[PDB]
Design a protein around this ligand. Structure first.
Ligand SMILES: C[C@@H]1CN(c2ncc(-c3cccc(Cl)c3Cl)c(N)n2)C[C@H](C)N1
Length: 494
């Protein structure tokens, strides 16, 4: 559950909700009104409400008086299972989620839609496809389901802010009603009104990207914000185990203590014997449909103590291309240590040897031609091409996708020219925001390469697929919009 997130409330409403309907330990999270792009954690403690700022410029969720997180659900899960402190040092306990009744971030809620609903279910629906729309009985709602084939409309009465389908139980929210009739389906002459999946509205034909971008650009905040927040609501389905990253011997191998690789997709390092735990790196394999040559490794920026493990990973996975999307230093803070030798220099990083053959400077990036081999084994040498994108802004995203697209095209062609190359290594600082953005753009553009402009692309479906393989891949609404703009610009220059 992610019912503790309220997408459309002010600080005043949040305070009033917690003081009248919550108790000490009650909490909620919400988008900031004073600074769009930020979030607020509002917590009831000692009969008063505290508002804690959460910032995200594209790399992670940074909680004031707390730690850095990959998603708001991982943030909430951490503090609900653990500590959060005020400026004066006092402990703030997250005990009771204060649940939201707003249906605006539900995949199935369409708001204003005529009984249009039938046209959408006929064209895109299948057996069990459903949606909820506003009724004409103003203030009431309509549940429209496809079964097969036919479309059935069930009236939803709203009486005293409770919802019902004519009889039986009265629900506190449309969400509660939908969940109930999803578990216990309504039965008609025998037709079972099974609610199998919400009607898909995000899958578009690539050719019509400009049209969808125009529609998403309109005020709902824009349609992009509403689509992104519906994707964010589904992050609670991705709380997979990250036990290996939490182990004592692995703690200092993480750039950010709470930003960890899922156990089920982490890169396991073999051939480590004097080191009790030599199999860990903060990296995950990312597959585009969840071949190694069409796959990626999403990882963090090297720490001084993880450089050797990084080169063990590249060697083992037979990776021939590295995509670096951060400077070594940004805003005076180290984002990635220099894990490569100076031009023309040779270095040993543990058992691995690396030669920097040549560097080539381009407008937005530097290419470093590297020769990687295992010490004592001449025949193991392979070229590793490091594409270092150097112009990404300190906060937010580039104003134009052109530069990223040109860079991505070059990376793709290098990778495609190498027979049986392993996955493309992609990293930034935490390895989830800019890394996830580059990877998602690359996946979507590759569909267009192979299939052409008439192919189907579904941006949040692709993101959700990438997010099931590494926490919080694609961090912000700005990156979300940037992915759409990059796909639009790619289709436009075809
Ligand atoms: C009628 C609703 C539809 N909607 C929406 N529908 C599905 C996804 C999505 C797709 C594929 C995978 C995942 Cl996880 C998701 Cl949430 C998404 N982002 N938005 C936007 C909302 C403002 N209005």
């Amino acid at each position: 559950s992610r019912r503790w997130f309220h997408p459309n409330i002010t600080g005043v409403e949040a305070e009033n909700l917690l003081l009248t309907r919550g108790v000490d330990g009650s909490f909620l999270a919400r988008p900031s009104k004073s600074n769009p792009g930020d979030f607020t954690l509002s917590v009831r403690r000692n009969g008063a409400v505290t508002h804690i700022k959460i910032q995200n410029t594209g790399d992670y969720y940074d909680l004031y008086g707390g730690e850095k997180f990959a998603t708001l659900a991982e943030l909430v899960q951490y503090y609900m299972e653990h500590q959060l402190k005020e400026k004066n040092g006092d402990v703030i306990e997250l005990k009771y989620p204060l649940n939201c009744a707003d249906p605006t971030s539900e995949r199935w809620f369409h708001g204003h839609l005529s009984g249009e609903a039938e046209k959408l279910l006929t064209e895109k629906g299948k057996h069990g496809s459903f949606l909820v729309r506003e009724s004409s009985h103003p203030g009431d709602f309509v549940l429209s389901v496809r079964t097969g084939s036919k479309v059935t409309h069930v009236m939803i009465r709203c009486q005293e802010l409770k919802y019902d389908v004519g009889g039986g139980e009265r629900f506190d929210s449309l969400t509660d009603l939908v969940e109930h009739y999803k578990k216990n389906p309504m039965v008609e002459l025998g037709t079972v009104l099974q609610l199998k999946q919400p009607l898909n509205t995000t899958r578009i034909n690539a050719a019509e990207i400009e049209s969808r971008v125009r529609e998403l650009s309109k005020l709902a905040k824009q349609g992009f914000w509403e689509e992104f927040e519906t994707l964010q609501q589904q992050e609670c389905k991705l709380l997979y185990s990250r036990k290996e990253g939490q182990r004592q011997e692995n703690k200092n191998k993480n750039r950010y203590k709470n930003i960890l690789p899922f156990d089920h997709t982490r890169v396991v390092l073999h051939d480590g014997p004097n080191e009790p735990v030599s199999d860990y790196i903060n990296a995950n394999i990312i597959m585009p449909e969840f071949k190694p040559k069409k796959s990626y490794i999403a990882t963090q920026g090297c720490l001084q103590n993880t450089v050797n493990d990084f080169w063990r990973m590249v060697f083992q996975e037979n990776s021939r291309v590295i995509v670096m999307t951060t400077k070594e230093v940004e805003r005076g803070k180290s984002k990635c240590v220099k894990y490569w030798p100076d031009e023309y220099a040779l270095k040993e990083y543990g058992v691995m040897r690396v030669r920097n053959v040549k560097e080539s400077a381009a407008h937005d990036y530097t290419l470093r031609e590297l020769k990687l081999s295992k010490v004592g084994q001449g025949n193991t040498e392979r070229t590793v091409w490091q594409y270092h994108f150097r112009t990404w802004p300190d906060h937010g995203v580039p104003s134009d996708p052109g530069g990223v697209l040109d860079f991505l095209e070059e990376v793709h062609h290098k990778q495609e020219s190498i027979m049986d190359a392993g996955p493309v290594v992609v990293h930034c600082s935490a390895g989830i925001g800019r890394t996830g953005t580059f990877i998602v753009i690359d996946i979507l553009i590759d569909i267009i390469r192979e299939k052409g402009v008439d192919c189907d692309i579904d941006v949040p479906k692709t993101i959700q697929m990438v997010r099931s393989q590494r926490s919080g891949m694609v961090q912000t609404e700005a990156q979300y919009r940037f992915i759409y703009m990059a796909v639009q610009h790619y289709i436009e220059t075809l």
